[model samples]
Target: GVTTFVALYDYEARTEDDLSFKKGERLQILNSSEGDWWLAHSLTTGQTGYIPSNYVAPS
Candidate 1:
């Protein structure tokens, strides 16, 4: 059987820095009144962030 998970809500970053996700980046998502954003504990240490939803497309 295939398991599926649906997004509770849609979100995207309004800034270049907010929407910069890379491979093998480890981070967590934070919620705000406007929307959700990604926070980096050690971005320079090879941590990754979340990509803007608009920039993402179906694969």
Candidate 2:
């Protein structure tokens, strides 16, 4: 199952696997059940990483 979401604000990666995204960017949620971090892919940049779950909202 795939879930679509959108970034609510700009985020900078704090680690190598952390995803950086811009405000209003579309993201495809790959994993969402791992505590505070969620694995997601950027639709615009094609980059995947673990982002904060609070950084995105259901689109």
Candidate 3:
């Protein structure tokens, strides 16, 4: 992961793979190339999953 991102807003997961994140949270960008359903490593949860691009912004 070359870039880092911050959760722009809170997101509650509806599916098993969606990484639930809280607003202002820190996370690692895995495959931002994953499109709108992007992949990420959660700093808070110590997990990895797909999260919406809408929920994060580049740092």
Candidate 4:
């Protein structure tokens, strides 16, 4: 399983250079399936992606 950053850029399914987020970027959570994934959005463009549910430290 890949370890993705939740609040970070959302990359394409298999590409690492096609990032869709920035450093220290904040995002909104839409849904999650926990085995190692959580659905989130970068904007209203519907640009959502799966990220690691344990990336960011507890706030």
TM-score of each: 0.27, 0.89, 0.81, 0.47
Per-residue error at 32 for model 2, in Å? 1.8
**Candidate 3 or 2, higher lDDT:** 2
| Off by more than 4 A, model 2 | none
Weakest ten-residue segment in model 1 by summed lDDT? 1-10
Clash pairs, model 1 backbone: 25-48
Q: Candidate 4 has which clashing residue pairs, if any?
A: 9-21
Q: Is candidate 1 or candidate 2 better by lDDT?
A: 2
Candidate that scores best on TM-score: 2
Candidate lDDT scores, in order, read 0.36, 0.92, 0.83, 0.49
Q: Tens digits of per-residue lDDT for model 3 on 10-55?
A: 9888899888888888889777675688888988778788888888
lDDT of 4 by residue, 1-59 (tens): 32333343333444442225544555566666556566666543446666565543222
Q: Rank the candidates by lDDT, best first.
A: 2, 3, 4, 1
Candidate 1: where is the Cα deviation over 4 Å?
Answer: 1-17, 32-50, 53-59
Clashing pairs in 3: none
TM-score of 2: 0.89
True-vs-predicted CA distance for residue 11, candidate 2, Å: 0.4
lDDT tens per residue, model 1, 1-59: 32212223333445656544443333333322344332433232453345433333222
The candidate that wins on lDDT is 2
> What is the model-wide C-alpha lDDT for candidate 4?
0.49
